[PDB]
Amino acid sequence: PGATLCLGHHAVPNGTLVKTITDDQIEVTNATELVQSSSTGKICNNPHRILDGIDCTLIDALLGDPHCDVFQNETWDLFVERSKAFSNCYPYDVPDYASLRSLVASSGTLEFITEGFTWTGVTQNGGSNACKRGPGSGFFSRLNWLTKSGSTYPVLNVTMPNNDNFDKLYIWGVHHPSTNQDQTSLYVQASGRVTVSTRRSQQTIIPNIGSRPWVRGLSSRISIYWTIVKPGDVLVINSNGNLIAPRGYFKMRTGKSSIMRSDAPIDTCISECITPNGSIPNDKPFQNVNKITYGACPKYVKQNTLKLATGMRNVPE
Amino acid sequence: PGATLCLGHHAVPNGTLVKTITDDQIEVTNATELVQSSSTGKICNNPHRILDGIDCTLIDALLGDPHCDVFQNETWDLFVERSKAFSNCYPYDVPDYASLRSLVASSGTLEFITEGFTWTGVTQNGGSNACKRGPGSGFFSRLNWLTKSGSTYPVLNVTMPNNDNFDKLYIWGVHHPSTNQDQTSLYVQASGRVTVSTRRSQQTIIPNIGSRPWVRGLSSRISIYWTIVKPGDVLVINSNGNLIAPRGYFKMRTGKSSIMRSDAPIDTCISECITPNGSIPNDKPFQNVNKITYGACPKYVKQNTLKLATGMRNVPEKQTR
Amino acid sequence: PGATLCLGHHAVPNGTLVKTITDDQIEVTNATELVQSSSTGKICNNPHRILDGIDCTLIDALLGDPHCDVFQNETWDLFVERSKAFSNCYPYDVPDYASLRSLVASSGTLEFITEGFTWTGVTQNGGSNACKRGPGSGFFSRLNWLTKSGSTYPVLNVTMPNNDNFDKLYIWGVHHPSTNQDQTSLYVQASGRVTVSTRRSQQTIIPNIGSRPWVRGLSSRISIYWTIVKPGDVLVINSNGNLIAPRGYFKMRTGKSSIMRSDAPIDTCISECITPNGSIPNDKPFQNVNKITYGACPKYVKQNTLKLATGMRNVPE
Ligand SMILES: *[C@@H]1O[C@H](CO)[C@@H](O[C@@H]2O[C@H](CO)[C@@H](O[C@@H]3O[C@H](CO[C@H]4O[C@H](CO)[C@@H](O)[C@H](O)[C@@H]4O)[C@@H](O)[C@H](O[C@H]4O[C@H](CO)[C@@H](O)[C@H](O)[C@@H]4O)[C@@H]3O)[C@H](O)[C@H]2NC(C)=O)[C@H](O)[C@H]1NC(C)=O
Ligand SMILES: *[C@@H]1O[C@H](CO)[C@@H](O[C@@H]2O[C@H](CO)[C@@H](O[C@@H]3O[C@H](CO[C@H]4O[C@H](CO)[C@@H](O)[C@H](O)[C@@H]4O)[C@@H](O)[C@H](O[C@H]4O[C@H](CO)[C@@H](O)[C@H](O)[C@@H]4O)[C@@H]3O)[C@H](O)[C@H]2NC(C)=O)[C@H](O)[C@H]1NC(C)=O
Ligand SMILES: CC(=O)N[C@@H]1[C@@H](O)[C@H](O[C@@H]2O[C@H](CO[C@]3(C(=O)O)C[C@H](O)[C@@H](NC(C)=O)[C@H]([C@H](O)[C@H](O)CO)O3)[C@H](O)[C@H](O)[C@H]2O)[C@@H](CO)O[C@H]1O
Ligand SMILES: CC(=O)N[C@@H]1[C@@H](O)[C@H](O[C@@H]2O[C@H](CO[C@]3(C(=O)O)C[C@H](O)[C@@H](NC(C)=O)[C@H]([C@H](O)[C@H](O)CO)O3)[C@H](O)[C@H](O)[C@H]2O)[C@@H](CO)O[C@H]1O
Ligand SMILES: *[C@@H]1O[C@H](CO)[C@@H](O[C@@H]2O[C@H](CO)[C@@H](O[C@@H]3O[C@H](CO)[C@@H](O)[C@H](O)[C@@H]3O)[C@H](O)[C@H]2NC(C)=O)[C@H](O)[C@H]1NC(C)=O
Ligand SMILES: *[C@@H]1O[C@H](CO)[C@@H](O[C@@H]2O[C@H](CO)[C@@H](O[C@@H]3O[C@H](CO)[C@@H](O)[C@H](O)[C@@H]3O)[C@H](O)[C@H]2NC(C)=O)[C@H](O)[C@H]1NC(C)=O
Ligand SMILES: CC(=O)N[C@H]1[C@H]([C@H](O)[C@H](O)CO)O[C@@](OC[C@H]2O[C@@H](O)[C@H](O)[C@@H](O)[C@H]2O)(C(=O)O)C[C@@H]1O
Ligand SMILES: *[C@@H]1O[C@H](CO)[C@@H](O[C@@H]2O[C@H](CO)[C@@H](O)[C@H](O)[C@H]2NC(C)=O)[C@H](O)[C@H]1NC(C)=O
Ligand SMILES: *[C@@H]1O[C@H](CO)[C@@H](O[C@@H]2O[C@H](CO)[C@@H](O)[C@H](O)[C@H]2NC(C)=O)[C@H](O)[C@H]1NC(C)=O
Ligand SMILES: *[C@@H]1O[C@H](CO)[C@@H](O[C@@H]2O[C@H](CO)[C@@H](O)[C@H](O)[C@H]2NC(C)=O)[C@H](O)[C@H]1NC(C)=O
Ligand SMILES: *[C@@H]1O[C@H](CO)[C@@H](O)[C@H](O)[C@H]1NC(C)=O
Ligand SMILES: *[C@@H]1O[C@H](CO)[C@@H](O)[C@H](O)[C@H]1NC(C)=O
Ligand SMILES: *[C@@H]1O[C@H](CO)[C@@H](O)[C@H](O)[C@H]1NC(C)=O
Ligand SMILES: *[C@@H]1O[C@H](CO)[C@@H](O)[C@H](O)[C@H]1NC(C)=O
């Protein structure tokens, strides 16, 4: 009178399909998802310092558009620019806008240090009704619009050495008048010139008189440029007209800072990974939410699902 | 007297060598090639719309070099530029030629819409014997060479708003005269200026008088620039001399369009994948024909062969010879 | 009284840890290192031709800064630029410095061929005490500083066709005077212009008068430009002032040549792979020494060690 001893394994009534070397679909007892495909829709305000630009681009906060004055000296790990942002100061362009935005974003600070530039024989603090600050005309807070004093605008020739142990970022510009009358009325000379240099490098910009499209009452424009001055080097600014002068420099840093375009609201929560769609968990190695990310994130892939088998082959009965 | 039952497997007289984790070469019963290494030498005319440039670069077709007039308003999935292409109009350069070529190639169309620009106090439709159109002097079809009327060239100041819901591409230029006599003779003012702007952006170009190498009779040149005007924005052109004016705009699109340099002839066949060497099949995952491709193509690799084993190890009977 | 026959395998007392699919660390009898993590600290002078720049950047050797005259017509597989290099001639900048440095580095030669440019009505061979040669003033050896003859500087208009079967590299420049007095004193015309062209392309540079920081006595500058002329094409140079003229061309090659920034000393040894830290062996497939390499090198990875198991699982007694 014997006995039977059967060896076996478990099964489940409803298995999951996975891919292998030999099968595009085969059933196993269990699997887990490796692609993060959803977001909360919200950017968590920890553990990264999130700075909401609201109505302001980083560049407008940098220049000091009056409605962006609240951003003076701000810092961030991630600056968030909104699609509703608008400019409301002198109409301007930045040749290589993208590079200036990038280098400031990456620096992570708008810390500004005022310097005592001496502008001999010119009028300082020019403004416009296109850039109101309170009820009266105004200007970008970090820039100093120089014009004639009496009936002359002399050749400006000034210096600022960098005797600190950090890099200085200087933002400056050039005014493009609408007419010859505007040019001579403001700067006396019929044609201006701005040359900004360090020991190693230089930029010279010739203004261009003429009409651009009307923006906030003006066919004139300002063009924005930048110059980095390293320790031991020196800034020199040289102009006989049309200079939009720096008031000082921005302190530069290196680190983890960046910038992102997103309309996702900011919320009080914790998430290492941020996308423009909102924060996403980072327990999974891959994600299909957005190729734009910031922080400790799963890697972006095209697949919306990939199943890692966590059990044996499911052979039901 | 019992019986013997032997288990076994097949072998074949002619195996193939494959690579594994442990072996650089080991013999299996069969294998299949994963690298496409040959082409027909011909570009198949389907399923993609292939436009043969023949004697014309895309840029010459865009500007409207007379021998390229047949390309007016053309469209393509793949524009094919030939090594025999030549220019035969006013000598010109395009700063950032590569970008203009790229953005037009990618747009996939030369559809041109003429606009009623008003050029007050200048002579229109200037031409050159370097750019013959029929028996007489001519010019790029899409550009309008403005010069003095009587003894004056006034400050030109014109606008064109974009009230459409698509982007407009404007092509314009600046004429560089050979001498001061040429400059004043054509434009009166001793030095010209072209400023083209939108709300957001602006380009100002100062012409430069002097000799460049003689091309079709001329040491002068034209430089070509472009400006995209989005819906709701406006073009403004401002000049007191040397303007080579747009006659209108090109309609821009987005899609699958591109451009390829190839001398391969175009033939009647069907192939998703195109290389400069000709079309190639796409049944294999890899290819070693050319890193330049267009369409549904195998991925370019350096190996000219890679064998995927499709059978077991091939073990012939121990050899008595 | 029968017998026992035990099958077994070897072990060692002290095994090595490797990583697998299932284990972060598991012990095997032996393994071999796949990441090269050390260097000698020295650059081997074979089998690649190493040219030590010493006190000279490649660009200064190219222009012919006097202390770099020893590099005239030199060749290299790898030009090594040292952090102690300095400039000691007219102060200058190169817009797109990085591209000029790259294309020269890649050409692998400073072979210079003098051409008989005819400069009618100007004074040739201008120099400066910022660029001393012998007891007197001097200049970049490969450039010809043109100034007025008598009371005129005429429109210069010269041509040079390329009837060779190689590309010609022309280096030229533009002088930026410190003052209007300097400009008219040297060139007569109040504003200069340099136009350098080939059949298909052209560059025009307007000089900019004004002060830059003092370097070796000077607030003036030279800006350096280049033009490649292919076989069958032709150079034209046209100027009414401020031209720093080429004396000829550099003969261009294509091949394996490059440039590296390193302070590692050069030694007599053999190594295919060079990093800025020094030469490294290339018996391993990966390396963690430096992402900058030249020659037959292991691929750069972030891991400092990766162990390929060369034996079975170690199960000691
Ligand atoms: C600034 O300096 C330059 C260089 O000296 C001058 O440019 C030259 O000017 C002359 C005169 O216009 C040009 O001569 C013409 O050459 C043509 C042949 O061209 C081919 O070969 C040359 C090489 O020698 C290539 O440059 C060119 O690309 C072609 O491959 C001839 O076809 C012309 O002949 C016709 O015109 C002349 C009248 O000028 C008649 O005698 C003939 O019968 C015929 O009708 C002509 O000989 C020369 O090509 C120019 N060279 C270059 C490199 O550009 C500028 O003119 C000068 N500027 C000023 C203001 O002085
Ligand atoms: C536009 O504005 C600028 C700024 O004022 C002017 O440029 C300055 O010009 C002055 C006078 O020409 C320059 O002065 C010279 O500086 C030399 C180097 O200075 C640097 O290095 C020394 C150490 O070697 C440091 O101590 C110093 O901080 C600097 O970093 C000096 O070596 C020169 O010395 C000579 O003169 C002095 C007289 O005071 C004597 O004691 C010496 O023995 C010697 O003879 C001299 O002082 C100055 O460097 C310029 N600065 C800059 C930033 O460029 C322009 O001149 C002006 N433009 C116009 C058109 O006017
Ligand atoms: C200084 C002054 O009041 N000048 C009178 C001009 O206002 C006037 O021209 C017109 O200007 C209008 C906008 O003007 C401002 C502005 O931007 O708000 C006024 C600013 O004070 C002035 N700032 C400075 C430093 O001068 C500024 C500046 O000149 C321009 O922005 C430079 O491009 O102009 C508006 O554009 C009107 O359409 C226009 O008529 C002139 C001519 O009427 O008279 C001046 O007395
Ligand atoms: C209008 C005219 O006929 N002017 C005479 C010039 O032809 C002549 O200069 C000669 O020009 C030759 C080539 O000339 C054209 C051309 O490009 O084909 C003729 C065109 O009609 C003219 N177009 C316009 C709108 O003016 C064009 C233009 O001026 C230049 O291309 C601009 O740079 O020139 C060739 O270059 C000869 O070498 C040259 O002598 C002058 C001087 O002799 O006399 C004029 O009567
Ligand atoms: C060159 O031509 C352009 C285009 O015609 C001129 O620009 C236009 O200038 C006028 C005023 O001179 C602008 O009109 C203004 O519009 C506002 C509302 O938008 C209105 O409230 C004002 O009363 C005023 O009429 C017009 O917008 C502007 N056009 C564009 C496209 O910007 C330019 O002034 C001409 N310049 C010269 C010197 O001829
Ligand atoms: C062992 O592997 C080889 C491939 O390395 C096999 O030969 C290939 O077989 C395929 C599919 O059976 C053949 O495709 C056919 O080609 C004809 C035209 O030639 C076409 O009309 C059919 O519709 C079909 O696509 C292919 O020709 C052939 N390729 C080569 C390079 O030989 C072989 O069949 C395998 N043998 C065994 C015994 O498994
Ligand atoms: C070809 C030539 O003119 N060489 C001059 C040179 C140039 O005029 C100058 O570099 C152009 O910018 O100037 C040299 O002078 C330097 C010296 O000039 C004095 O006038 C002034 O007192 C000083 O401040 C200083 O600039 C030079 O060495 O560069 C002389 C040279 O012969
Ligand atoms: C995250 O946001 C991106 C960017 O808007 C979304 O991508 C868009 O969504 C659909 C297809 O998914 C398209 O109609 C758009 O053209 C896409 N734009 C881009 C730039 O890719 C994405 O779907 C969002 N993902 C999640 C999970 O919310
Ligand atoms: C496809 O064309 C490429 C490019 O023309 C061929 O590779 C070139 O072959 C030339 C000589 O014929 C060599 O000197 C170069 O090494 C190659 N050029 C480049 C740019 O890589 C290639 O062999 C062709 N392939 C086939 C299958 O025809
Ligand atoms: C080779 O040289 C590089 C560059 O000088 C060394 O990298 C530095 O070392 C540590 C990381 O190990 C960092 O803190 C530094 O910031 C690194 N510098 C840079 C520029 O990355 C590297 O360690 C050297 N390696 C060896 C083996 O000598
Ligand atoms: C699948 O994954 C884990 C087990 O590691 C667990 O969360 C879940 O209950 C499992 N499901 C099934 C059906 O086994
Ligand atoms: C910016 O930086 C410092 C504060 O640490 C100071 O110099 C300056 O007053 C600050 N400005 C503002 C507006 O906070
Ligand atoms: C190009 O297209 C437009 C409208 O789509 C048309 O008005 C124009 O005449 C066309 N030109 C040619 C040459 O077909
Ligand atoms: C360990 O493996 C390497 C590579 O095969 C070999 O050179 C070395 O001698 C081996 N050492 C031992 C102790 O087996």
XYZ file of N, CA and C in Angstrom, chain C residues 90-202:
339
model
N 51.144 92.120 -29.942
C 50.038 93.094 -29.922
C 48.815 92.450 -29.248
N 48.130 93.187 -28.353
C 46.946 92.578 -27.770
C 45.873 92.356 -28.823
N 45.217 91.204 -28.740
C 44.319 90.766 -29.799
C 43.181 89.926 -29.271
N 42.128 89.829 -30.065
C 41.112 88.809 -29.855
C 40.831 88.083 -31.168
N 40.265 86.883 -31.045
C 39.818 86.124 -32.185
C 38.354 85.790 -31.985
N 37.450 86.476 -32.698
C 36.060 86.008 -32.686
C 36.036 84.566 -33.193
N 35.343 83.698 -32.499
C 35.453 82.266 -32.833
C 36.898 81.709 -32.760
N 37.616 82.170 -31.742
C 38.904 81.583 -31.327
C 38.864 80.043 -31.355
N 37.850 79.473 -30.715
C 37.738 78.029 -30.581
C 37.751 77.305 -31.946
N 37.062 77.852 -32.944
C 37.040 77.236 -34.276
C 38.386 77.330 -34.986
N 39.061 78.471 -34.863
C 40.353 78.646 -35.513
C 41.365 77.692 -34.889
N 41.381 77.636 -33.556
C 42.233 76.714 -32.835
C 41.960 75.274 -33.262
N 40.674 74.918 -33.368
C 40.290 73.574 -33.771
C 40.767 73.199 -35.184
N 40.499 74.063 -36.155
C 40.826 73.717 -37.532
C 42.356 73.668 -37.736
N 43.109 74.524 -37.058
C 44.564 74.471 -37.153
C 45.078 73.199 -36.457
N 44.608 72.946 -35.235
C 44.978 71.737 -34.493
C 44.795 70.479 -35.341
N 43.662 70.435 -36.022
C 43.266 69.293 -36.817
C 44.079 69.152 -38.112
N 44.515 70.290 -38.654
C 45.385 70.304 -39.808
C 46.784 69.734 -39.489
N 47.279 69.948 -38.272
C 48.497 69.283 -37.823
C 49.802 69.907 -38.293
N 49.741 71.104 -38.871
C 50.914 71.789 -39.381
C 50.769 73.306 -39.333
N 51.905 73.993 -39.170
C 51.976 75.451 -39.337
C 52.774 75.858 -40.586
N 52.853 74.960 -41.560
C 53.593 75.196 -42.774
C 53.062 76.429 -43.465
N 53.917 77.428 -43.636
C 53.534 78.713 -44.174
C 54.251 78.992 -45.506
N 53.488 79.411 -46.504
C 53.993 79.689 -47.832
C 53.741 81.161 -48.124
N 54.804 81.913 -48.319
C 54.735 83.362 -48.575
C 54.210 83.599 -49.995
N 53.329 84.576 -50.142
C 52.796 84.960 -51.442
C 53.112 86.437 -51.696
N 53.318 86.788 -52.968
C 53.719 88.145 -53.338
C 52.557 89.103 -53.486
N 51.896 89.431 -52.387
C 50.849 90.447 -52.410
C 51.502 91.801 -52.710
N 50.855 92.583 -53.576
C 51.325 93.916 -53.939
C 50.431 94.935 -53.237
N 51.006 95.682 -52.303
C 50.268 96.687 -51.532
C 50.744 98.068 -52.014
N 50.053 98.598 -53.012
C 50.457 99.833 -53.684
C 50.014 101.063 -52.897
N 50.981 101.919 -52.569
C 50.704 103.214 -51.925
C 50.564 103.181 -50.413
N 51.013 102.095 -49.770
C 51.007 101.992 -48.307
C 52.378 101.633 -47.779
N 52.574 101.888 -46.496
C 53.787 101.511 -45.801
C 53.570 100.126 -45.224
N 54.541 99.230 -45.407
C 54.425 97.841 -44.913
C 55.212 97.658 -43.630
N 55.038 96.495 -43.006
C 55.875 96.044 -41.868
C 55.788 96.886 -40.585
N 54.603 97.419 -40.308
C 54.358 98.102 -39.041
C 54.607 97.219 -37.830
N 55.053 97.833 -36.743
C 55.338 97.129 -35.485
C 54.983 97.943 -34.253
N 55.203 97.328 -33.099
C 54.844 97.915 -31.816
C 55.858 97.502 -30.767
N 56.033 98.361 -29.755
C 56.820 97.988 -28.595
C 56.100 96.998 -27.675
N 54.830 96.725 -27.933
C 54.147 95.608 -27.298
C 54.569 94.245 -27.859
N 55.301 94.252 -28.967
C 55.682 93.012 -29.642
C 57.129 93.105 -30.135
N 58.030 93.151 -29.176
C 59.436 93.434 -29.414
C 60.141 92.279 -30.170
N 60.975 92.712 -31.095
C 61.842 91.848 -31.854
C 63.200 92.501 -31.826
N 64.156 91.894 -31.146
C 65.533 92.420 -31.160
C 65.543 93.657 -30.287
N 66.319 94.710 -30.656
C 66.238 95.968 -29.916
C 64.974 96.813 -30.201
N 64.296 96.568 -31.312
C 63.180 97.407 -31.703
C 61.781 96.818 -31.548
N 60.862 97.565 -32.113
C 59.475 97.192 -32.187
C 59.348 96.099 -33.219
N 58.294 95.312 -33.094
C 58.030 94.242 -34.058
C 56.574 93.861 -34.095
N 56.296 92.700 -34.674
C 54.939 92.304 -34.950
C 54.856 90.801 -35.161
N 53.625 90.308 -35.213
C 53.351 88.922 -35.599
C 54.066 88.639 -36.909
N 54.857 87.566 -36.943
C 55.659 87.254 -38.131
C 54.833 87.000 -39.392
N 53.623 86.466 -39.258
C 52.814 86.091 -40.429
C 51.839 87.155 -40.913
N 51.857 88.312 -40.263
C 50.963 89.406 -40.573
C 51.752 90.663 -40.943
N 51.149 91.500 -41.784
C 51.812 92.673 -42.358
C 50.939 93.895 -42.044
N 51.378 94.705 -41.088
C 50.610 95.868 -40.649
C 50.843 96.992 -41.656
N 49.800 97.328 -42.409
C 49.870 98.375 -43.418
C 49.391 99.697 -42.845
N 50.122 100.770 -43.153
C 49.733 102.145 -42.804
C 49.946 103.075 -44.004
N 49.554 104.333 -43.864
C 49.697 105.321 -44.939
C 51.142 105.476 -45.446
N 51.266 105.844 -46.719
C 52.519 106.270 -47.328
C 52.329 107.729 -47.719
N 53.203 108.594 -47.227
C 53.015 110.032 -47.380
C 51.751 110.493 -46.652
N 50.828 111.080 -47.408
C 49.590 111.625 -46.849
C 48.333 110.877 -47.325
N 48.515 109.695 -47.921
C 47.403 108.913 -48.456
C 47.469 107.426 -48.044
N 46.280 106.835 -47.911
C 46.103 105.395 -47.852
C 45.037 105.117 -48.916
N 45.443 104.593 -50.085
C 44.466 104.355 -51.152
C 43.626 103.119 -50.883
N 42.584 102.919 -51.679
C 41.809 101.695 -51.629
C 42.725 100.547 -52.074
N 42.978 99.599 -51.181
C 43.745 98.412 -51.526
C 42.824 97.362 -52.102
N 43.277 96.751 -53.189
C 42.480 95.794 -53.927
C 43.416 94.768 -54.547
N 43.559 93.611 -53.905
C 44.433 92.540 -54.395
C 43.734 91.209 -54.466
N 44.302 90.329 -55.269
C 43.758 89.005 -55.536
C 44.836 87.946 -55.498
N 44.448 86.718 -55.156
C 45.393 85.607 -55.114
C 44.593 84.333 -55.428
N 44.768 83.772 -56.631
C 44.019 82.547 -56.927
C 44.662 81.325 -56.304
N 43.871 80.301 -56.020
C 44.400 79.022 -55.570
C 44.436 78.067 -56.747
N 45.623 77.952 -57.364
C 45.837 76.932 -58.412
C 46.516 75.665 -57.910
N 46.574 75.479 -56.605
C 47.075 74.233 -56.031
C 45.933 73.238 -55.875
N 46.272 72.019 -55.462
C 45.277 70.977 -55.189
C 44.981 70.759 -53.689
N 45.345 71.735 -52.855
C 45.126 71.690 -51.399
C 44.421 72.974 -51.009
N 43.802 72.973 -49.834
C 43.199 74.195 -49.285
C 44.235 75.111 -48.681
N 44.043 76.411 -48.891
C 44.858 77.442 -48.304
C 44.113 78.107 -47.156
N 44.801 78.251 -46.015
C 44.299 79.014 -44.882
C 44.997 80.368 -44.828
N 44.225 81.441 -44.958
C 44.720 82.791 -44.792
C 44.293 83.360 -43.445
N 45.275 83.883 -42.699
C 45.019 84.579 -41.439
C 45.249 86.061 -41.679
N 44.272 86.862 -41.290
C 44.331 88.295 -41.468
C 43.679 88.951 -40.275
N 43.683 90.271 -40.256
C 43.078 90.962 -39.153
C 42.689 92.384 -39.435
N 42.183 93.002 -38.380
C 41.717 94.358 -38.400
C 42.246 95.064 -37.147
N 42.797 96.253 -37.340
C 43.305 97.047 -36.236
C 42.225 97.989 -35.719
N 42.059 98.000 -34.398
C 41.110 98.864 -33.694
C 41.912 99.929 -32.973
N 41.968 101.150 -33.537
C 42.724 102.210 -32.878
C 42.074 102.692 -31.589
N 42.903 103.264 -30.721
C 42.460 103.772 -29.417
C 41.684 105.094 -29.527
N 42.047 105.938 -30.495
C 41.471 107.287 -30.689
C 41.285 107.629 -32.167
N 40.490 108.657 -32.434
C 40.335 109.204 -33.787
C 41.657 109.735 -34.359
N 42.485 110.304 -33.498
C 43.800 110.810 -33.900
C 44.661 109.659 -34.430
N 44.686 108.558 -33.686
C 45.360 107.306 -34.081
C 44.853 106.785 -35.452
N 43.530 106.718 -35.611
C 42.907 106.268 -36.848
C 43.373 107.079 -38.051
N 43.234 108.400 -37.987
C 43.545 109.254 -39.146
C 45.041 109.360 -39.351
N 45.776 109.402 -38.249
C 47.226 109.392 -38.300
C 47.780 108.164 -39.046
N 47.204 106.984 -38.811
C 47.681 105.746 -39.454
C 47.077 105.467 -40.827
N 45.786 105.748 -40.996
C 45.050 105.337 -42.194
C 44.422 106.454 -43.022
N 44.541 107.711 -42.568
C 43.972 108.898 -43.234
C 42.454 108.940 -43.144
N 41.780 107.968 -43.750
C 40.319 107.877 -43.681
C 39.879 107.770 -42.220
N 38.772 108.426 -41.889
C 38.260 108.502 -40.516
C 37.646 107.182 -40.047
N 37.237 106.348 -40.995
C 36.723 105.029 -40.697
C 37.225 104.041 -41.748
N 37.812 102.937 -41.288
C 38.327 101.889 -42.176
C 37.298 100.817 -42.484
N 37.750 99.809 -43.208
C 36.905 98.721 -43.659
C 37.803 97.628 -44.238
N 37.539 96.375 -43.878
C 38.213 95.240 -44.467
C 37.172 94.270 -45.009
N 37.256 93.998 -46.310
C 36.400 93.007 -46.966
C 37.292 91.949 -47.610
N 37.155 90.723 -47.125
C 37.895 89.568 -47.625
C 36.886 88.564 -48.162
N 37.068 88.147 -49.410
C 36.065 87.326 -50.086
C 36.657 86.221 -50.942
N 35.835 85.190 -51.150
C 36.040 84.171 -52.176
C 34.865 84.248 -53.163
N 34.792 83.343 -54.141
C 33.686 83.383 -55.097
C 32.314 83.311 -54.441
N 32.175 82.395 -53.479
C 30.858 82.115 -52.870
C 30.600 82.849 -51.572
N 31.640 83.347 -50.879
C 31.444 83.944 -49.554
C 32.301 85.172 -49.275
N 31.967 85.885 -48.210
C 32.632 87.144 -47.884
C 32.493 87.518 -46.401
